[PDB]
């Protein structure tokens, strides 16, 4: 079991110029079982590389097949002979592979000073060194080019800011030239139309994280431990089972509340232990995002497609956690927008659930702002109040056009993660009178109003309530100053998208400008 410790391994050499080296090599390999062909093609195992950048090694990088160091075979025929020693396994062979950035000269540009210092650290980290910006003696250029020259140098690589973070993951240099460069009916398909975007939003997290880390057979091994995997993520496929049930018997219906009552029994199940341990996922995120260089690597690929909208792994996380109180918020504008006994009895059921949510004190903190518009709100819906939702921004706002309120009526607008409240002045409490408490999944579209001063600061959404069976302008005035209008409609917008449960928020925002006036 020393001749068999090379067995069914197929080497090629590249970069050996004295022939008395590569001799030894080549009989040692011989002796352990493996065998070497003089050309490189889809059947070699490992190349060894003497030196990196020919011909063999180019096309090596390309397969993604192991290069390696003649310090593998040495230390292989050192231990050929222990018991069921065999020269392929990782955590034997990881320490001889040829480091990613072996002879590769970096540069960067498009990040800041903390980022910019990461990347040259981990370059040093993986072998590599780096020249400040537009050097001869640079064999790369890599850069965050969504910001999007100098140096234009013909030999450099001008990669795309894939390449640095694939090569880290891989743990191996990764290839060049891949980078370079019916009232209450309208109720309802809306409770279906995101309850299909929340489960599109659990299969992104579970086939773009956890699957990928979970898989055997990783380039460069495993990411992350078994168990701080299961920290992570926990429940959330069980999760994804029970809404896709829910979903399924949703859409072929097109009593609701016994839907959600057989499926209460599911929910309590596996909410609480995804969600009170919510802090420590994003503590360990956190955590292996800095401690462990790979999976920063992952998560800068993963991130980066499009399927998540510039959303982080844990704001898409957030989405469970905010997941049921926009329910309820859609089955109580369901039931009164409507035997109703059918919906009451599962919306305290749903309530129910909410108490073995143990409290994080920013969750005190938060609801101590949304009492402070129920408060103020004279008919405020009460249930606004019973969830563990918050309060995002306050906006004052002269209202324009027939809706919601009459022309020319002072309104404020309170935006929570999940909803809009609308109240108007009246004809501190009851300072304000309540209009409508708007399910953020109502709003079809928002607009940007540009600034003619025929009108100013103006801004307008499209919304479809259940009552009136079709689209309707809400035309405003901003008249605070604490924000720029830009940065509000963004605010808008991204909370839009949150409770749709559409990672993509910029599907959203348009700029017109004809319909409104002063």
């Given at each position: 079991?020393?001749?068999?410790?090379?067995m069914?391994?197929?080497?090629?050499f590249?970069?050996?110029?004295?022939?008395?080296?590569?001799?030894?090599?080549?009989?040692?390999?011989?002796?352990?079982?493996?065998?070497?062909?003089?050309?490189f093609n889809?059947?070699?195992?490992?190349?060894?590389?003497?030196?990196?950048?020919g011909?063999?090694?180019?096309?090596?990088?390309?397969?993604?097949?192991?290069?390696?160091?003649?310090?593998?075979?040495?230390?292989?025929?050192?231990?050929?002979?222990?018991?069921?020693?065999?020269?392929?396994?990782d955590?034997?062979?990881?320490e001889?592979?040829?480091?990613?950035?072996?002879?590769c000269?970096?540069?960067?540009?498009?990040?800041?000073?903390?980022?910019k210092?990461?990347?040259?650290?981990?370059t040093?980290?993986?072998?590599?060194?780096?020249?400040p910006?537009?050097?001869?003696?640079?064999?790369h250029?890599?850069?965050?080019?969504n910001?999007?020259?100098?140096?234009?140098?013909?030999?450099?690589?001008?990669?795309?800011?894939?390449?640095?973070?694939?090569s880290?993951?891989?743990?191996?240099?990764?290839g060049?030239?891949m980078?370079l460069?019916?009232?209450?009916?309208?109720?309802?398909k809306?409770?279906?139309?995101?309850?299909?975007?929340?489960?599109?939003?659990?299969?992104?997290?579970?086939?773009?994280f956890?699957?990928?880390?979970?898989?055997?057979?990783?380039?460069?091994?495993?990411?992350?431990?078994?168990?701080?995997?299961?920290?992570?993520?926990?429940?959330?496929?069980?999760?994804?089972?029970?809404?896709?049930k829910?979903?399924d018997?949703?859409?072929?219906l097109?009593?609701?509340?016994?839907?959600?009552?057989?499926?209460?029994?599911?929910?309590?199940?596996?909410?609480?232990?995804?969600?009170?341990?919510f802090?420590?996922?994003?503590?360990?995120?956190?955590?292996?995002?800095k401690?462990?260089p790979?999976?920063?690597?992952?998560?800068?690929?993963?991130?980066?497609?499009?399927?998540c909208?510039?959303?982080?792994?844990?704001?898409?996380?957030?989405?469970?956690?905010?997941?049921?109180?926009?329910?309820?918020?859609?089955?109580?504008?369901?039931?009164?927008?409507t035997?109703?006994?059918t919906?009451?009895?599962?919306?305290?059921?749903?309530k129910?659930?909410?108490?073995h949510?143990?409290?994080?004190?920013?969750?005190?903190?938060?609801?101590?702002?949304?009492?402070?518009?129920?408060?103020?709100v004279?008919?405020?819906?009460?249930?606004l109040?019973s969830?563990?939702?918050?309060?995002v921004?306050?906006?004052?706002t002269?209202?324009?056009?027939?809706?919601?309120?009459?022309?020319?009526?002072?309104v404020?607008?309170?935006?929570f993660?999940?909803?809009?409240?609308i109240?108007?002045?009246?004809?501190?409490?009851?300072?304000?009178?309540?209009?409508?408490?708007?399910?953020?999944?109502?709003?079809?579209?928002?607009?940007?109003?540009?600034?003619?001063?025929?009108?100013?600061?103006?801004?307008?959404?499209?919304?479809?309530?259940?009552?009136?069976?079709?689209?309707?302008?809400?035309?405003?005035?901003?008249?605070?100053?604490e924000?720029?209008?830009?940065?509000?409609?963004?605010?808008?917008?991204?909370?839009?998208?949150?409770?749709?449960?559409?990672a993509?928020?910029?599907?959203?925002?348009?700029?017109?400008?004809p319909?409104?006036?002063?």
């Amino acid at each position: 079991g020393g001749c068999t410790s090379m067995m069914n391994l197929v080497l090629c050499f590249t970069g050996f110029r004295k022939k008395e080296e590569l001799v030894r090599l080549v009989t040692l390999v011989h002796h352990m079982g493996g065998v070497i062909r003089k050309d490189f093609n889809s059947k070699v195992t490992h190349l060894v590389a003497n030196c990196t950048q020919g011909e063999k090694f180019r096309v090596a990088v390309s397969l993604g097949t192991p290069i390696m160091k003649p310090e593998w075979i040495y230390k292989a025929w050192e231990r050929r002979n222990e018991q069921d020693f065999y020269a392929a396994v990782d955590d034997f062979r990881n320490e001889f592979k040829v480091p990613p950035f072996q002879d590769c000269i970096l540069s960067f540009l498009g990040f800041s000073d903390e980022e910019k210092t990461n990347m040259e650290e981990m370059t040093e980290m993986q072998g590599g060194k780096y020249l400040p910006l537009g050097d001869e003696r640079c064999t790369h250029l890599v850069v965050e080019e969504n910001i999007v020259p100098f140096e234009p140098s013909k030999k450099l690589y001008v990669v795309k800011q894939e390449w640095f973070w694939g090569s880290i993951q891989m743990d191996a240099r990764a290839g060049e030239t891949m980078y370079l460069y019916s009232a209450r009916w309208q109720v309802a398909k809306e409770l279906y139309q995101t309850e299909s975007n929340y489960v599109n939003i659990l299969a992104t997290i579970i086939q773009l994280f956890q699957v990928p880390l979970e898989e055997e057979g990783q380039r460069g091994g495993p990411i992350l431990a078994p168990e701080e995997i299961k920290t992570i993520f926990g429940s959330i496929p069980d999760i994804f089972d029970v809404h896709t049930k829910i979903k399924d018997d949703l859409e072929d219906l097109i009593s609701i509340g016994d839907i959600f009552l057989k499926y209460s029994k599911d929910l309590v199940k596996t909410y609480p232990p995804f969600v009170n341990f919510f802090e420590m996922s994003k503590e360990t995120i956190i955590k292996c995002e800095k401690q462990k260089p790979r999976f920063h690597a992952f998560l800068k690929i993963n991130q980066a497609k499009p399927e998540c909208g510039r959303q982080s792994l844990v704001e898409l996380l957030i989405r469970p956690v905010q997941r049921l109180p926009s329910v309820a918020l859609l089955l109580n504008d369901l039931k009164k927008h409507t035997d109703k006994s059918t919906l009451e009895k599962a919306i305290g059921s749903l309530k129910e659930v909410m108490t073995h949510i143990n409290e994080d004190k920013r969750k005190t903190e938060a609801q101590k702002q949304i009492f402070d518009v129920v408060y103020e709100v004279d008919g405020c819906p009460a249930n606004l109040l019973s969830s563990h939702r918050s309060l995002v921004q306050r906006v004052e706002t002269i209202s324009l056009g027939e809706h919601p309120c009459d022309r020319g009526e002072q309104v404020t607008l309170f935006l929570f993660n999940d909803c809009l409240e609308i109240a108007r002045k009246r004809h501190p409490p009851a300072s304000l009178k309540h209009i409508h408490l708007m399910p953020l999944s109502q709003i079809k579209k928002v607009l940007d109003i540009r600034e003619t001063e025929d009108c100013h600061n103006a801004f307008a959404l499209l919304v479809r309530p259940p009552t009136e069976q079709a689209n309707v302008l809400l035309s405003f005035q901003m008249t605070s100053d604490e924000l720029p209008k830009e940065n509000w409609l963004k605010m808008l917008c991204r909370h839009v998208a949150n409770t749709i449960c559409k990672a993509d928020a910029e599907n959203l925002i348009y700029t017109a400008d004809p319909e409104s006036f002063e």
